[PDB]
Symmetry: C2
Subunit: 291 residues, 2 copies
């Protein structure tokens, strides 16, 4: 049966400013065995291996920096930071030769230390260690999406805020005729500073798609249900194939909205003003006096 | 031949502490025609339609707050923000009755204003306007992925820091037998503060998959090539089906790594310690004296 206790006594050491924790049991002559844990574990992972090894060798299992009972200093916790703090943990204990028992990122660390002090590593016990993974096909399928998600950053902000996707990508995507550089530079001009793209990223995150955001969903619903009953003269322009108002939806609204005249601007996506402003303008002009 | 220039003298109005640009052309009296642009455009979007309406009617084309030549305050730029600024802008100019010409988020503003001020809207010309989108199948396929991307947050950080996925999700996912609540509480204790979950999240983002990060890929490739030529004794534990080291890969590293004994721990995924610690310690301890 697998035991749940952590029956080891806390041993602390100061190193590069931080107090790290490590279990230390076993004798003090000969070769120590250094137990290196991974993510999101700590020395507790070894609680039921160590007692088999303790009655013969020194068992040293440290809590990696920022984990376990070691102190949690505010830094990135890059791999090269665990490297710095572990090297420094080893020497802070004066360890000479060691036998390594490693797992996971513990194994990236142990292996990497052993390559940098080969003369000093007398044996390596490993399990489930980090090799390179050439393709995502070799990650087990039941875990692939989860680990693919873990490496997904702020995709929306990176497209819109960083790469300016709504100017550089959506405008030409959503106009049928090609825009010109002069036109695109007019469009680029108010968002040359990335920080100013905040509204260009909040807008699509505010769209009423699949029930969210709920507030905007209900507000749009309410004005659309006002619109469906109001006798206000309405002029709907629509293009083929459109984006938000595809041709079949323009037809339905033609009879679905009171007192609504619709106009076929021809081939259009989203910015119909940029594919056929002449027809949109003249039809507005002709429709106005009749109000 | 579509016009590229913007031949409009700039008008400005002071609306809730912020200067707002607007186009103002055409006769004074009569019912004004108010053009509302959307994302990510401005009154420039309207530039070739206005020439058709200006002969007969006043044309007012504001640049929404944060956009065009209008002031860029430090808002989040929610829809509610624009509703506050547009409303004040309409009142700032004294507009009584209007005719809206609206598109995109301009249409969401115009419609929502008109619903609150119906007796003030003499007409509505609209194009590609915002209505509730029930499912993502309603969105054009050629743009579906891009707009879902726009609405993707920091998926990695929300799972690991906010939702604690490596502790609540990966640990039981990666251990064949069930963890008890006491064991889960030992694993939870280092990171009850979500800010302290930094390494939990940076570790999977450091894994060497698909060449990223290139530097961790190289460092791990170096100690692996070192390992394949080093004669240090190695004891490789592995389970079925494993995660990082499946049975067949274990089998090949039995031959590929010199001075290597291999121990099948039986069923197992990634935290083999938690599936067969006795066999692991037992075999380490019988391996140690022969070092």
């Amino acid at each position: 049966e697998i035991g749940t206790g952590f029956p080891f006594d806390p041993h602390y050491v100061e190193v590069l400013g931080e107090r790290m924790h490590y279990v230390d049991v076993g004798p003090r002559d000969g070769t120590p065995v250094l137990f290196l844990h991974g993510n999101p574990t700590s020395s507790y992972l070894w609680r039921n291996i160590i007692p088999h090894v303790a009655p013969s060798h020194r068992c040293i299992a440290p809590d990696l920096i920022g984990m376990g009972k070691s102190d949690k200093p505010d830094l990135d916790y890059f791999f090269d930071d665990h490297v710095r703090y572990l090297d420094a943990f080893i020497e802070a204990l004066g360890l000479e030769e060691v036998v390594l028992v490693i797992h996971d990122w513990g194994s990236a660390l142990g292996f990497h230390w052993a390559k940098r002090n080969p003369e000093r590593v007398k044996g390596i016990a490993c399990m489930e260690f980090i090799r390179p993974i050439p393709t995502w096909d070799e990650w087990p399928e039941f875990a692939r999406e989860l680990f693919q998600a873990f490496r997904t950053p702020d995709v929306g902000r990176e497209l819109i805020i960083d790469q300016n996707a709504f100017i550089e990508g959506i405008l030409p995507k959503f106009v049928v005729r090609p825009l010109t550089e002069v036109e695109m530079d007019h469009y680029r001009e108010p968002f040359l500073k990335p920080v100013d793209r905040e509204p260009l990223w909040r807008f699509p995150n505010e769209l009423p798609i699949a029930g969210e955001p709920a507030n905007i969903v209900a507000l749009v619903e309410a004005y659309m249900n006002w619109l469906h009953q109001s006798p206000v003269p309405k002029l709907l322009f629509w293009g083929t194939p459109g984006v938000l108002i595809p041709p079949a939806e323009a037809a339905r609204l033609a009879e679905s909205l009171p007192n609504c005249k619709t106009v076929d601007i021809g081939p259009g996506l989203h910015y119909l003003q940029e594919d056929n402003p002449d027809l949109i303008g003249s039809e507005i002009a002709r429709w106005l006096p009749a109000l």
